[PDB]
Symmetry: D3
């Protein structure tokens, strides 16, 4: 890929946003599928349709034009993405991840990512919440990477490390807060693997992914994390296990919303 | 992202339906060396890929592909003699273009065949492997014929692939194979597709086998994904033309010979199976 | 799919052939931090990549690459000081453009070197790993310098890659290392290439190791594939500059010395 | 080669028809400084170009265009406030996208207005010129919104342009103008379109006049061609905001322009009652 | 800068040379309604454009073009039945691809024909206009089949175009027209090419006429330019099928047959 | 085409040049075909190949790669282009004109453009030097313009005027300076018309162009002038009439080059500021 955005594009978008809202969030949240209801938990919200924001990719699915919402979650100023972009919709990664770099320029310091995923870990049950401790970037293995192209030093280094991508401290807080919520099910934890999609996996692919050490599978999130870490954002996230993948040839969403809301109090600064 | 619009598929289907009175219910994509299947076909009417509107055109000089409509074993079908591969430069939305056209022609079942390298230790050159499942390596990185906005007139946004290879046809393939009475048993397994065109290193071969792959090739998977997305029943076979070497210690005319004989066997197998396809 | 036509490779080769009287028999691609190999050349003649027709141009500012012709250790060769990477935005047909040009110049052997992360826990920082085999992850998805119609004037449609790293040179590499009487042993293993530019997560590292990989990098494999397709003998090394995270320089000069020594073991 | 397929136009039309109850019969493309027409419209409903599926988005940072539906003077209209130009980088198939959408909405007449430079020596700043014909310079080189395979559902392969500007509306324009009781006559002439964005050199101005042109601009023609191709009745005007320089050797000009704009706006409103059906 | 590389042309030429034994010395590009010239051709071998390697493919539905080799009037030639136009979406380097292939086949003379609108008021519907010169409007803005680095194996960087339409053939055309038994004079003039697909407004027609144009169309010029660049002898005609509107104020089937017969006769006048 | 270069690209190229040379040119000269010898006669010259300069378009003709040369001409520091880019070679105008914007960022205030052209005016003879008083941009009529695309306000306005593109003062000084030279032939003056190329004109086209009011015809320069005026550069230039265009259907260099070169050197002293 040849990242089509120039440094000034990001600046223009950030400048437009900074002049259209007086809010200055320190945390950005990307709402996964069916988790958009999180925006309704914000107070003093101001919304911007993706379509009106300069340089912003526009939603694909008809009748579901995305929105960027600035607001207060749990005493914390946030900027949230209601609706996201996926590689399977035809968006190259430099477009899918455009918002992450804009957030960095707005002054955001932490990125919370959430998604709905397929459970590969045999212990997982539909409705479980999995704290993402690590990921496997399959598209990245072949070069499909949002960082492809000459490096923009104003954002980060040429070869950013990913071994510490999911903040270790937030991990501990996530477990503490979960116990405070008193759930019948434990807080799951593990590796998220991303693949292109849009078709779901065959049985042989699921077995293969599980042996790769993956716990949950999806078609997003990884590109955003890579860009976030590259530009210095702290990151943490969760996968909502909406289905158990088929391994043989033979509500929960509100809980996650509450969980993310409570964790706002655990984000540094 | 797919460059064809819904009406492009319709225009091609309309062109074909107006140029032939045949109305096939089954489509067959012949792999390499299985091109002889077109013979054995009766009342055949041929269209060179090059003359069909919107149809991708062959790459290998002197081997322009052809779409042939004819009767195989009393069953009307349309066959692809020569196919398209990612390694030739075609994106998957072009490689799989014909599959959606077939659906629009009224086809309800797609039969896919190919030549593949054997990964399973029980496999021998000349074996025929019923495809029970597949591993789409290109799909892992986003190279997918379904990439782009979803066309609901074909299928859903997130089509399932766990039951891609028809279970009923699998049972019929096994019973038919027995009725054929062959020296070798009908193998069965997972086909893994990778880009090509170079063949694998020993390390890649060991890796693929560990992934659970039984046969390796550079086609078929894309077609199957598109077929399932638009509702086509699918079943297919891999002709094992060569055994892959799994180690460094281990150090041809007979290999080619075993391949040609196996190919004739696959042709008869596919012909007999026509009677087993429902409807 | 490859945007260069056969005549483009020829035009570039002729330009070089008419701008230098040297006729290299060996080509060397210098990995990261190994550019110093060029200084060992004598009778050196340099050409900036930027001035050579059809040649891709470096991306990192202040580090414009160069093609240098000269004698290393009694052998005529052409060296690449600075390389091209997929992570930089180049499609493989551009990354490997030079390999086909070298073949047209008359080169018969290609030496590939690179810096890599150590996956095999036996490797220590500074170790040299003779490349015995490779795993082309980008190739699994079709990202291949050979993608597109085949140019028979270079090679066959389906080149074999199982015998990519010359067995003879691998034996001489081991014999030469012992003759040098080095304290540390000469490592050997499988090199796996992934796109980059980010480094691996712990999960990816564990995965790659289980795939049978000993060293990981973001180059070399494309050039090797193209080299073998057009008939070049191939051998190379990874300089293990770091041990990848598996849980939650005199070394470079030694490689440069070793590669220089092996020039004498190259046939013809 | 057009980048939109027939169904893209239908999608946009369907979207609009399901987001407004207004059913326009006439479309108005407002020229530079003529966006005030949108005011004086009642029962108005606005859509930013940015939110409309497939619609090109304005380049000029600061004035994101919008589509406005409403009743003008007894007629249901859809108006473009903000336009697209070739000089901005839009290929003609994007510039004219709205025209085909309008036809699919049920629009039967297209009114095009623009600000233009005066080539006719008799023209004065503030004059309003009924467009009687045009000269498509970009079309001479193949830059044409119709380039590519023809879409028969819109129109024929070789559309005629000799009768592009409706003769009946031309008579209606002169009648309505006369009734308004204006002292300055309603000018009439040929509009020539060129790419832009730079203004003409003296040599170019003379050349243009010798070609038979009365006014020069960088828009409108592409739209008129697409409109006639899909069967829309067309008529329009050029507001002469400046006299081009013809020799090698202001507040009043601005004023005459401002007043002429208001005048053209009133003129178009009145003309709504003379549109057939 | 032209999508095709020299070897692309060679491949196509080789394909044709190995699929037919005929070796044409002349090539004819049939205009609108003049495809019937392919008939009255003996020992004809036809190839659909679609099957010929690198050949552009027709856009008009149900009218797939074809290349036909055969003897016309004692001369071996290759004819294009159906052509390519910029208004259809083809860049000029594609529209003119066949011309360079013809040169590589051994063709020495190119006969171009087309249907055109009459600008010269002296012209009447059905008239045949010998092309004496042309005006390349798309060329004024850089839209040219020769745009890009020059391929010397074909021609020079800056080819002259003032002597594009062979003087001798034009003189031969006027002398041969006699035996056509036509009571109508053989017209002659300047052909002006513009993009299309829409027809001219009144103002454009008056303008084109004042430019010195006698007939207007949407083709031919790109082919002539490439033909002259690679050294081909060029000869051409426009069939005036309509008189453009110059103010706001069955027969054609016979006219085409007339041109076809005329072109056939001229075969005997082509040198060598 | 809406121009593929971003503002920062021009800045990057200017910064690179400014850090590789200490010279601060106030004048930029684009040498036409056969006028390349102007680079000589330049003192304290520093040269840069187009190929090594970041973002710089590269020459197409094999064996003759272009160079950017910085030096002193006649007491005036300047930068010259030896080798140019033409639309007929495949370059879009945003590439052809890239150097002009870089010059502006380098601190250049005046652009001198020269070229070889065909004479349309019956009074011109081969070897005549024609001061460009105005131009006709044929490609511009159809939209082929280096300014196509969103306007970059940091360079100039959206609708720049071109009625006064060729500096009147320099034109007056050119005629006065020519006098001093005491040449036999007079310094011609006229309208330059730009066509795409690469083929030369037919008789019909030549007659057409003359009727359009053109005095000389060529395939360059106009784009550079348009971009120069857009970013506020003072402009003046000349066409060396290398050939006389044929207008009659019946009808069957070096020398002036050096002359134009010494003339341009002389004019350096007349350039303001
Ligand atoms: C489709 C959904 C992800 N997603 C949910 N379930 C699955 C599954 N079984 N397999 C794959 N490959 N992806 C799955 O997207 C949710 P997101 O937008 O929040 O990432
Ligand atoms: C090249 C052949 C497939 N094909 C046959 N053998 C192999 C092998 N060992 N490795 C790979 N990667 N592909 C193999 O194509 C046959 P198809 O066109 O019928 O798929
Ligand atoms: C970045 C460097 C390669 N390279 C060096 N270390 C690593 C590492 N840990 N992981 C990956 N993926 N690549 C690594 O490139 C060196 P080359 O240009 O000589 O290939
Ligand atoms: C710039 C303005 C048109 N426009 C106004 N005056 C001129 C002029 N002198 N020359 C050219 N070429 N165009 C002119 O656009 C107005 P529109 O958007 O309503 O067409
Ligand atoms: C459409 C036809 C040309 N063609 C025929 N009549 C006209 C006309 N009045 N105006 C224009 N611009 N073109 C005209 O093409 C015929 P050809 O394919 O033989 O060139
Ligand atoms: C080819 C030369 C220009 N050039 C010189 N003479 C002519 C002529 N008669 N017609 C056209 N169209 N161009 C002509 O280029 C000179 P430059 O590079 O200095 O512009
Ligand atoms: Ca938008
Ligand atoms: Ca786990
Ligand atoms: Ca075709
Ligand atoms: Ca270069
Ligand atoms: Ca439809
Ligand atoms: Ca939009
Ligand atoms: Ca008039
Ligand atoms: Ca050759
Ligand atoms: Ca074809
Ligand atoms: Ca360069």
């Amino acid at each position: 890929m040849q990242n089509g955005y120039t440094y000034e594009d990001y600046q223009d978008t950030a400048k437009w946003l900074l002049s259209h809202t007086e809010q200055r969030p320190q945390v950005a949240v990307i709402c996964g599928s069916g988790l958009g209801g999180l925006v309704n938990k914000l107070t003093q919200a101001q919304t911007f349709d993706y379509s009106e924001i300069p340089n912003f990719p526009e939603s694909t699915v008809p009748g579901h034009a995305g929105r960027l919402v600035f607001g207060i979650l749990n005493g914390r100023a946030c900027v949230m993405m209601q609706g996201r972009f996926h590689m399977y919709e035809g968006y190259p990664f430099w477009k899918v991840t455009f918002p992450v770099r804009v957030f960095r320029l707005l002054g955001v310091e932490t990125l919370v990512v959430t998604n709905a995923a397929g459970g590969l870990n045999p212990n997982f049950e539909v409705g479980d919440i999995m704290l993402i401790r690590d990921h496997i970037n399959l598209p990245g293995f072949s070069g499909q990477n949002p960082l492809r192209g000459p490096n923009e030093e104003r954002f980060g280094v040429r070869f950013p490390a990913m071994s510490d991508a999911y903040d270790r401290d937030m991990r501990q807080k996530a477990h503490s807060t979960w116990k405070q919520m008193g759930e019948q099910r434990e807080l799951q934890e593990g590796t998220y693997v991303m693949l292109g999609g849009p078709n779901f996996e065959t049985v042989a692919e699921c077995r293969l992914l599980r042996n790769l050490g993956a716990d949950a599978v999806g078609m997003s999130t990884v590109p955003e994390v890579i860009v976030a870490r590259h530009c210095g954002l702290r990151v943490f996230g969760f996968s909502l296990i909406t289905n158990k993948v088929i391994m043989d040839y033979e509500q929960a969403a509100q809980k996650l919303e509450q969980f993310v809301s409570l964790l706002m109090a655990s984000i540094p600064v």
